[PDB]
Homo-oligomer: A and B are copies of this chain.
């Protein structure tokens, strides 16, 4: 349902042991196939958290892509993620903390 019919972007997370998990790799291959299907703007936006994960030893299929850094401070990562999102002209909605 959602990955094909009702998805706009993607937020893969590159942890230390994220490469081991077979399910995340399977859904990653699904995302790669749907990107090969669409070819409109971009779908995949990686994230990096750990300090042990060196910038070169990242998952092999994703070496081609860069990553916004979170190793220093989460606030700036959230800030540049959000302003990149709003620059990408994603449809908006008025905020409501009550739902949260």
Q: Is the CB of B63 within 8 A of A37?
A: no
Interface size band for A: 10 to 19
In chain B, what residue has the closest Cβ to A22?
A: B64
Chain A stretch 43-68: residues in CB contact (< 8 A) with chain B = 56, 60-61, 63-64
Cβ of A30 within 8 Å of any chain B Cβ, yes or no, is yes
Cβ of A42 within 8 Å of any chain B Cβ, yes or no, is no
Chain A stretch 1-53: residues in CB contact (< 8 A) with chain B = 25-26, 29-30, 33, 36-37
Q: Which residues of B contact A26 (CB under 8 A)?
A: 60-61, 63-64
Q: Can you pick out 10 interface pairs between chain A and chain B where the beta carbons lie within 8 Å of each other? A: A25-B64, A26-B61, A26-B63, A26-B64, A30-B60, A30-B63, A33-B56, A33-B63, A36-B56, A37-B56
5 nearest A-B residue pairs (beta carbon) = A33-B56, A29-B63, A29-B64, A26-B64, A30-B60
